[PDB]
Design a protein around this ligand. Structure first.
Ligand SMILES: NS(=O)(=O)c1ccc(CCN/C([SeH])=N\c2ccc(I)cc2)cc1
Ligand SMILES: NS(=O)(=O)c1ccc(CCN/C([SeH])=N\c2ccc(I)cc2)cc1
Ligand SMILES: CC(=O)N[C@@H]1[C@@H](O)[C@H](O)[C@@H](CO)O[C@H]1O
Ligand SMILES: CC(=O)N[C@@H]1[C@@H](O)[C@H](O)[C@@H](CO)O[C@H]1O
Ligand SMILES: CC(=O)N[C@@H]1[C@@H](O)[C@H](O)[C@@H](CO)O[C@H]1O
Ligand SMILES: CC(=O)N[C@@H]1[C@@H](O)[C@H](O)[C@@H](CO)O[C@H]1O
Ligand SMILES: [Zn+2]
Ligand SMILES: [Zn+2]
Lengths: 277, 277
C-alpha cells in the first residue's frame, strides 16, 4: 500500500504507485505564500454549524496513519456563503503532526511549519447525495485546515483540546490500529471560534494521501489555535500501523507540492481572504 | 431526458434537471475575451498524431443531438507537451451548428458566434485507462474546439471537409437517429494544419451537455478553419431526435456561461497561448 516512513512505499513513490492522481499538477499541500497570493474580498467568513436534532455518536479510530474522528451523517456542516442550508456536510476530522515541535503540518505559511495541522473533511452535499458519491467525483470535497501552535502558559479551557473534549482520553500508547472508540462530540463551532474564521488561504487542490484525488476545495486558516506540549505529546503516543518503518506515530505529513509544476496545462492561483475591513 | 429545442427539457432546465453538475460555477461554454485573458508563454503548440499500426474502422452516428464521429481506441492522440507518449487519447468528434450562418458555435470569441464548432474529445490516458473510467472522474477529459468560418471562394482540398473526407458522403435527410455508418478515417492532422495550433484559449471547464461534468481541460483555437455554404448545409439536413421540437438538426449549442458566477468559491482564469515569438 502506502506509508509515510517506509522509503519503499513513502511519499516520494506515490507519483508512481498511484499515478491517478498523485502524478497530477493540482496537488496538495503547498506553501501558502502571503506575498504571491491574490486577495479576494468576495470570500466570506466561514461558519461551522450543527444540526441540533442529531443524536448519533461520534467515534475515533487509529487507522494506522492518523487519528480520525468520524462524525455521524447529517450533523455538522460548513457554510461559505452565510446561509445555513447544508451545502457542505462534514464527514471526519484527522490530524498531521511531527516527531518534534518544529514540524508536523502539511501546509506551510511563508515556509513555516506548525506542530499539528487538523483537517476537517466535508462533501459538497449541494451537488452529491453521499460522502461515497462525492469522494471520487469532480468538485466533491472541501477541507478546512486548522494550524495549532504550542504555548507554555494557558488554561485547558482556552486550548483546542476543550473543543476536542480531550478526545475522551483515547490518545495513548494502547490506542492500537485499527481500534475505534466512541468519544464525546467535538464542538467544531468552538474550535473555529479559537481563530479568525475570515482570515484564510483558498485554492483548488487534492487529497494529501493516495490516491491524491484533485477534487478538494482547500481553506487553510492563517491564525493557529493553541495547544500545550503535553497535548502534542499525546498524539505522539499512538503507534503507527505495521506498514510503517517508525514505531510511534509522527511525521505523518506529505512533502510540499508546487502550486504550478512546470508541466501544468492550466495554472491555478492561490487566493487569500480577510474580514470586511 | 434533455434537448436543445424542447422547452420542457431544453438548456434553461439543465441547472434544475441535472444539479450535478449543470448547476456548478466552472461551466462551459464561455465568452473567450482576448482582453480579459492571461497570456501564458509556457503553453505549447498542440499536436495531433496517429498510431499507424491501428487498422480498426471509424464510424459516424446521428445520436439525435449531433453528428458524432467515433474513433477506434488506441488510434488518435493529442500531445500538449511535444512528447508523443499517448497522454491524451481521442475518443470522438462531434459538432455544434446553427439554423443560420450567423450562429452555431458554443464558445464565442469577443462575443462573436461562428457557424460551426467541432469538439475533438479525448481522455487523459496518462491517468485513466479507458474513456468510461475517465468520463466521470476529476481531470479526466480534454476537448479541442475548432471554429469554422464560411467562405465563398475556395478549393475543396483546402476546406475542413477535405480533412473530414466529406464524412464519406454519409450526411443526408435519411441519416436518422440512432443510425451509424462506417466512414473513411478523418485526417485530424490535416485538420489541425488548416489553423494555427499554437494560438488558442485555455481554461478549466465542463461538458456542454448534461451532466455538465466539471472535468474538462478546454483548448479553443482562435483561428477558424474554412468551409463552404454547401458544406454547412450538409449538417442542417440531419433530422433531430424525437425529444426535440425542431425537425431539422440545428442550434444544437448551449447558452454562454460566466467564467466566474457570483457563487464561485475559487475563481478560474482564462489563459491564452501564442507561438514562441
Ligand atoms: N489529508 S486530506 O485531508 O487531504 C484527506 C481527506 C480525506 C481522504 C479520504 C480517505 N481517507 C479517509 Se476517509 N480518512 C483518512 C484521511 C487521512 C488520513 I492521514 C487517514 C485517514 C484522504 C485525505
Ligand atoms: N460538447 S462536449 O465536447 O462538451 C461533450 C463531450 C463529451 C460528452 C460526454 C457524453 N457524450 C458523448 Se461521450 N458524446 C456526445 C457529446 C456531445 C454531443 I451534442 C453528443 C454526444 C458530453 C459533451
Ligand atoms: C439537514 C439535515 O441533515 N437534517 C437532519 C435530518 O435529516 C435528521 O432526520 C435529524 C435527526 O437525525 O437531524 C437533522
Ligand atoms: C475530561 C475533560 O473533559 N476535561 C479534562 C480537564 O479537566 C483536564 O484538566 C485535562 C488534562 O488532565 O484534560 C481534559
Ligand atoms: C499506443 C497504442 O495505443 N498502440 C497500439 C497498440 O496497443 C495496438 O496493439 C496496435 C494494434 O491495433 O495499435 C497501436
Ligand atoms: C466533394 C464531395 O465529395 N462532396 C459530396 C457531395 O457531392 C454529396 O452530395 C454529399 C452528401 O453528404 O457529400 C459531399
Ligand atoms: Zn489530512
Ligand atoms: Zn460538444
Amino acid at each position: 500500500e502506502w506509508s509515510y516512513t517506509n522509503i519503499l512505499t513513502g511519499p516520494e513513490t506515490w507519483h508512481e504507485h498511484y499515478k491517478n492522481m498523485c502524478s497530477g499538477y493540482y496537488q496538495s499541500p503547498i506553501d501558502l505564500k502571503t506575498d504571491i497570493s491574490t486577495l479576494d474580498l468576495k470570500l466570506k467568513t466561514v461558519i461551522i454549524y450543527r444540526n441540533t436534532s442529531s443524536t448519533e455518536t461520534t467515534t475515533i479510530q487509529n487507522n494506522g496513519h492518523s487519528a480520525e474522528v468520524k462524525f455521524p451523517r447529517n450533523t455538522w456542516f460548513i457554510s461559505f456563503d452565510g446561509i445555513l442550508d447544508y451545502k457542505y456536510e462534514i464527514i471526519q476530522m484527522h490530524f498531521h503532526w511531527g516527531n518534534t515541535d518544529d514540524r508536523g503540518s502539511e501546509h506551510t505559511i511563508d515556509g513555516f511549519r506548525f506542530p499539528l495541522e487538523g483537517h476537517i473533511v466535508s462533501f459538497r452535499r449541494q451537488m452529491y447525495s453521499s460522502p461515497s458519491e462525492a469522494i471520487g467525483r469532480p468538485g466533491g470535497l472541501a477541507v478546512l485546515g486548522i494550524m495549532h501552535q504550542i504555548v507554555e502558559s494557558i488554561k485547558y479551557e482556552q486550548t483546542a483540546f476543550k473543543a476536542y473534549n480531550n478526545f475522551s482520553g483515547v490518545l495513548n500508547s494502547q490506542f492500537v490500529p485499527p481500534n475505534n472508540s466512541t468519544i464525546d462530540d467535538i464542538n467544531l463551532a468552538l474550535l473555529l471560534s479559537l481563530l479568525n474564521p475570515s482570515r484564510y488561504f483558498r485554492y483548488l487542490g487534492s487529497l494529501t494521501t493516495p490516491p491524491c484525488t484533485e477534487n478538494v476545495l482547500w481553506t487553510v486558516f492563517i491564525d493557529p489555535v493553541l495547544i500545550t506540549r503535553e497535548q502534542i505529546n499525546l498524539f505522539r503516543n499512538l503507534p503507527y500501523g505495521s506498514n510503517e518503518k517508525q514505531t510511534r506515530m509522527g511525521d505523518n505529513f506529505r512533502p510540499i507540492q508546487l502550486l504550478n509544476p512546470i508541466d501544468t496545462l492550466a495554472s491555478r492561483t492561490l487566493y487569500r481572504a480577510t474580514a470586511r475591513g
